[PDB]
Design a protein around this motif. Structure first.
Motif, mmCIF file in Angstrom:
data_model
loop_
_atom_site.group_PDB
_atom_site.id
_atom_site.type_symbol
_atom_site.label_atom_id
_atom_site.label_comp_id
_atom_site.label_asym_id
_atom_site.label_seq_id
_atom_site.Cartn_x
_atom_site.Cartn_y
_atom_site.Cartn_z
ATOM 1 N N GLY A 94 0.797 -1.216 0.000
ATOM 2 C CA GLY A 94 0.000 0.000 0.000
ATOM 3 C C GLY A 94 0.832 1.270 0.000
ATOM 4 O O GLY A 94 0.318 2.355 -0.285
ATOM 5 N N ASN A 95 2.123 1.157 0.318
ATOM 6 C CA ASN A 95 2.943 2.344 0.538
ATOM 7 C C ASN A 95 3.842 2.686 -0.647
ATOM 8 O O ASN A 95 4.642 3.619 -0.544
ATOM 9 N N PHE A 96 3.742 1.960 -1.764
ATOM 10 C CA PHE A 96 4.667 2.196 -2.870
ATOM 11 C C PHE A 96 4.224 3.355 -3.754
ATOM 12 O O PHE A 96 5.066 4.054 -4.329
ATOM 13 N N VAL A 97 2.916 3.563 -3.900
ATOM 14 C CA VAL A 97 2.387 4.568 -4.814
ATOM 15 C C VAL A 97 1.314 5.384 -4.110
ATOM 16 O O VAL A 97 0.728 4.951 -3.113
ATOM 17 N N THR A 98 1.055 6.574 -4.649
ATOM 18 C CA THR A 98 0.102 7.518 -4.080
ATOM 19 C C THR A 98 -1.091 7.789 -4.986
ATOM 20 O O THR A 98 -2.030 8.466 -4.560
ATOM 21 N N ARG A 107 -1.254 -3.604 -9.347
ATOM 22 C CA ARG A 107 -1.680 -4.786 -8.608
ATOM 23 C C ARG A 107 -2.253 -5.842 -9.544
ATOM 24 O O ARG A 107 -1.950 -7.032 -9.407
ATOM 25 N N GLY A 133 -6.128 -6.903 -1.243
ATOM 26 C CA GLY A 133 -6.188 -5.507 -0.841
ATOM 27 C C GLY A 133 -4.858 -4.806 -1.008
ATOM 28 O O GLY A 133 -4.348 -4.643 -2.121
ATOM 29 N N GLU A 153 7.604 -6.450 -4.952
ATOM 30 C CA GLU A 153 8.049 -5.078 -4.731
ATOM 31 C C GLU A 153 8.462 -4.412 -6.038
ATOM 32 O O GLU A 153 8.152 -3.239 -6.266
ATOM 33 N N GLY B 88 -10.449 -10.312 0.598
ATOM 34 C CA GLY B 88 -9.793 -9.279 -0.173
ATOM 35 C C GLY B 88 -9.197 -9.742 -1.482
ATOM 36 O O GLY B 88 -8.561 -8.936 -2.169
ATOM 37 N N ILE B 89 -9.400 -11.006 -1.864
ATOM 38 C CA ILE B 89 -8.645 -11.583 -2.969
ATOM 39 C C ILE B 89 -8.964 -10.841 -4.255
ATOM 40 O O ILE B 89 -10.130 -10.582 -4.577
ATOM 41 N N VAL B 90 -7.920 -10.494 -4.998
ATOM 42 C CA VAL B 90 -8.051 -9.814 -6.279
ATOM 43 C C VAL B 90 -8.060 -10.862 -7.381
ATOM 44 O O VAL B 90 -7.165 -11.712 -7.445
ATOM 45 N N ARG C 116 9.913 4.579 3.780
ATOM 46 C CA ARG C 116 9.768 4.234 2.374
ATOM 47 C C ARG C 116 9.034 5.367 1.673
ATOM 48 O O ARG C 116 8.013 5.852 2.172
ATOM 49 N N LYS C 117 9.554 5.783 0.522
ATOM 50 C CA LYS C 117 9.019 6.938 -0.183
ATOM 51 C C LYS C 117 7.836 6.530 -1.054
ATOM 52 O O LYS C 117 7.941 5.606 -1.867
ATOM 53 N N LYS C 118 6.711 7.228 -0.886
ATOM 54 C CA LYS C 118 5.532 6.935 -1.693
ATOM 55 C C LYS C 118 5.754 7.307 -3.153
ATOM 56 O O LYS C 118 5.232 6.641 -4.055
ATOM 57 N N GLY C 119 6.507 8.372 -3.404
ATOM 58 C CA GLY C 119 6.709 8.869 -4.753
ATOM 59 C C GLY C 119 7.257 7.834 -5.714
ATOM 60 O O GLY C 119 6.686 7.601 -6.778
#
Ligand SMILES: [Mg+2]
Ligand SMILES: [Mg+2]
Ligand SMILES: [Mg+2]
Ligand SMILES: [Mg+2]
Ligand SMILES: [Mg+2]
Ligand SMILES: [Mg+2]
Ligand SMILES: [Mg+2]
Ligand SMILES: [Mg+2]
Ligand SMILES: [Mg+2]
Ligand SMILES: [Mg+2]
Lengths: 210, 124, 119, 61, 141
Positions: A94-98, A107, A133, A153, B88-90, C116-119
């Motif tokens: 969840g924290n890789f992209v905005t 995903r 999710g 990742e 939550g499975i995609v 960790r950077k979101k960008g």
RNA sequence: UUAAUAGGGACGGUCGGGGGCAUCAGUAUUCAAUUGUCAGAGGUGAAAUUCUUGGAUUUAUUGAAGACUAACUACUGCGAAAGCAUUUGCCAAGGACGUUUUCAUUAAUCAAGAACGAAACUAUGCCGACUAGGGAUCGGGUGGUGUUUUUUUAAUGACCCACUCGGCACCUUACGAGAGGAGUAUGGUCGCAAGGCUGAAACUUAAAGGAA
């Protein structure tokens, strides 16, 4: 000898399937002298050691088993966690992209069309992978888990997983050739200033007449 | 995208898993996985030039059997999708008319009988 | 029954078996898979961890400790939260060696909010 | 057929079967392996019975 | 239906069908007029006067009870605003936002909302200028 | 003259991970100080590189710096979009609902103009001025009911049911003029291309290689 116990909550929708299989779960855990409890009122599953327990580390695997069952992993697949080789890993994504759309599309890239990309990764890494999710739960041997983390990742950093699937296939054939064990495999691998106040509005033609 | 071996393995991953290191090489693969893989490849090549009616033909089945087979398969898909939805499975995306290809699809060879979709509804 | 604290750090590439007093300030015996194996590929193996635990357990019996509380952990941080294979094998070896296992806990460093950077 | 196509065991055994059946007269040709499935029939075996061969040799009408 | 917003709400008052005073209402019409004048003298606006009369004095509607609107009643007695009440509140809101933008120059959202408020003033001001309620030379700020 | 299930403004209790400025906390990472022990530690498929008896890695206590705001986190909420997730305070702003409060057509769509504003890589859905619905969910309101709750300190909710307005989506339904691909062949044009051991030709020529 105090008793070591772990308890895990599960969603209510998952209750029906746990009730059917609990005899199998009890039977599997009894082989290691680990006692378990399924509380449907509180929605919790507990695993606890007994006086006959001889393996000190089995309770940690039993704890992982109940966690997997709560996360919708089928029992025939999850029960493999009791084996020494198998391990379970949960990867955050969840924290890789905005940007929400960029999150969704990357995903899906992990799943692939018709699930082809995900199935190919499972076969090569021998891991059970489930994308949920904002997380990816993967189970399997430690070598496979390490590979799955890199692909998951890297996918979220704009590296198409199809590159990783190709890379794993090439690394496997190289692993079967003894001459190139020492030599580096890299050559075979694929490569004006802001103003707070708005400007004035252009008057309407009727305003000019007024 | 133009790597024949890599693309073949990805498309054929579902059959190989059902009928099983993984033996994806052509020389290594044996058994039902070989027969299903060759047929899958040959149908893919024939789709470009062969007429739609002639290339694919559903095996003759009585109505009361085929309608029953479709109903049970659809129920399995709905259970699979609901269970994934409540979790939550995609899941991979499927076009509207087509049936989703669950694991039971590959093992049971259901598509040769029921087909990818109901053509009568697609035509209208 | 004199109690110590067995701090096991099971990474994918190595395993530390470290026994200390209850405060943790006084190190009693630290043994690693790398010291008990000859090749760099087998440091993470269960076998290398098994040898490390046996060496530690003997030393713990020398000083006087007979029981230990286990505090296993993984690399944590932004990396995996799952202990490697050595930690599970090391825990078994301590029991078979004869040391009483008091309590087992997972103390992996879990960040609230990673760097960790979101960008 | 389910053995891999380049298997030496597969090629050897299919030829032996084609050799033996052609010698018996059950198979007219040895060229194609699909004949083992398509062209292996009870009629082929009955066609080697003594009365039929007498008929084809014109020993009987 | 909202201008400058995507909302489609329909919340509103539903004026009753009958246009005569309620039977239970037993207060003189003249008394209501004096109450209106008193409140206006205190500084209450026509919108607020109707709330107080309706809430505490049983005046369902000033027009129904007295036959004349609150605005006309006040004007008959010398009470009249500088500018229409709706325009008065739009200008005050614009002033408050401009004050805030003075202290906080990084509030780009407030800058966006000010444009919407000033746009509402221009449309409303133009209407009143057309009807001659507002003098033709009048300009906002 | 009405007071549009047109539009605006007002008032009431609210709702929000909307914005700006301060403020608070959290473990993690890096660095530093002490601190026990001693030969490896990270990393790879192997390595290389890097740190290390001046004590690395690891252990305990403590401090500082920058970033971030896990789990709770949802086919949920807010914002015009881009976007927004710790506590508390301030500053204005906003939506829906409720109203027997107020203006009285002030409006809708809008080229121009104005404000804000490495990446992609398997997807896809007939469209509309358009009917009737179903389940679930968010915010507001009305009524019923009896469990949580509780008592003249002030505040005073949660759940269940029915109805209703406005949202995010899902699943169904009635109606509508809505006006090239895959290949083959080539007495043409333009390019790219064969061979004979190397040395070694004006020299039948050395040493050393190649083949055998
Ligand atoms: Mg409004
Ligand atoms: Mg109205
Ligand atoms: Mg208000
Ligand atoms: Mg707020
Ligand atoms: Mg704020
Ligand atoms: Mg913040
Ligand atoms: Mg919320
Ligand atoms: Mg919105
Ligand atoms: Mg939080
Ligand atoms: Mg609704």
């Amino acid at each position: 000898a105090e008793e070591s116990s772990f308890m895990t909550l599960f969603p209510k929708y998952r209750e029906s399937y746990l009730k059917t299989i609990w005899n199998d779960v009890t039977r599997a855990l009894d082989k290691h002298n680990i006692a378990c409890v399924l509380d449907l009122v509180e929605g919790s599953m507990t695993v606890k050691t007994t006086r006959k327990t001889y393996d000190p580390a089995i309770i940690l695997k039993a704890r992982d088993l109940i966690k997997l069952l709560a996360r919708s992993v089928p029992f025939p697949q999850a029960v493999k966690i009791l084996q020494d080789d198998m391990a379970c890993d949960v990867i955050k994504i969840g924290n890789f992209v905005t940007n929400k759309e960029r999150f969704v599309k990357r995903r899906q890239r992990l799943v692939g069309p018709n699930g082809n990309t995900l199935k190919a990764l499972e076969l090569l890494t021998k891991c059970y992978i489930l994308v949920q999710g904002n997380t990816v739960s993967a189970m399997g041997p430690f070598k496979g888990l390490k590979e799955v983390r890199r692909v998951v990742e890297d996918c979220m950093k704009n590296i198409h997983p199809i590159y990783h699937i190709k890379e794993l296939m090439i690394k496997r054939e190289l692993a079967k050739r003894p001459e190139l064990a020492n030599e580096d495999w890299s050559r075979f691998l694929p490569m004006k200033v802001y103003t707070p106040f708005p400007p004035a509005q252009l008057p309407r033609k009727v305003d000019l007449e007024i | 995208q133009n790597d024949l071996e890599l693309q073949q393995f990805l498309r054929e991953s579902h059959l190989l898993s059902a009928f099983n290191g993984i033996v994806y090489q052509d020389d290594q693969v044996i058994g039902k996985a070989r027969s299903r893989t060759l047929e899958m490849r040959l149908n893919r090549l024939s789709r470009v030039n062969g007429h739609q009616d002639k290339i694919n033909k559903l095996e003759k089945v009585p109505m009361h059997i085929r309608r029953g087979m479709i109903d049970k398969h659809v129920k399995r898909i709905k259970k699979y999708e609901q269970e994934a939805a409540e979790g939550g499975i995609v899941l991979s995306k499927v076009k509207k008319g087509q049936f989703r290809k669950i694991e039971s699809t590959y093992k049971k060879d259901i598509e040769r009988r029921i087909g990818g979709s109901i053509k009568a509804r697609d035509k209208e | 029954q004199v109690f110590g604290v067995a701090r096991i750090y099971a990474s994918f590439n190595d395993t530390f078996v470290h026994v200390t007093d209850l405060s943790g300030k006084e190190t009693i015996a630290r043994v690693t898979g790398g010291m008990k194996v000859k090749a760099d590929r087998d440091e993470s193996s269960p076998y290398a961890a098994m040898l490390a635990a046996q060496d530690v357990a003997a030393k713990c019996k020398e000083v006087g400790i007979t029981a230990v509380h286990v505090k296993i952990r993984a690399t944590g941080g932004t990396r995996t939260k799952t202990p490697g294979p050595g930690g599970q094998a090391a825990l078994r070896a301590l029991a078979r060696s004869g040391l009483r296992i008091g309590r087992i806990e997972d103390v992996t460093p879990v960040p609230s909010d990673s760097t960790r950077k979101k960008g | 057929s389910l053995l891999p196509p380049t298997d030496p065991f597969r090629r050897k055994h299919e030829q032996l079967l084609l050799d033996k059946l052609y010698a018996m007269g059950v198979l007219t040709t040895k060229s194609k392996i699909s004949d083992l499935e398509n062209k292996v029939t009870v009629s082929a075996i009955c066609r080697r019975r003594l009365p039929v061969i007498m008929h084809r040799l014109k020993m009987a009408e | 239906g909202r201008m400058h917003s995507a909302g489609k709400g329909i919340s509103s008052s539903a004026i009753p069908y009958s246009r005569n005073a309620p039977a239970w209402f037993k207060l003189s019409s003249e008394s209501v007029i004096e109450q209106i004048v008193k409140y206006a003298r205190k500084g209450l606006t026509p919108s607020q006067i109707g709330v107080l009369l309706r809430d505490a004095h049983g005046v369902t509607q000033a027009r129904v009870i007295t036959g004349n609107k609150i605005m006309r009643i006040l004007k008959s007695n010398g009470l009249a605003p500088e500018i229409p009440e709706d325009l008065y509140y739009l200008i005050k809101k614009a002033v408050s936002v401009r004050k805030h933008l003075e202290r906080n120059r990084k509030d780009k959202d407030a800058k966006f909302r000010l444009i919407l408020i000033e746009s509402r003033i221009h449309r409303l001001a133009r209407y009143y200028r057309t009807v001659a309620v507002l003098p033709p030379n009048w300009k906002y700020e």
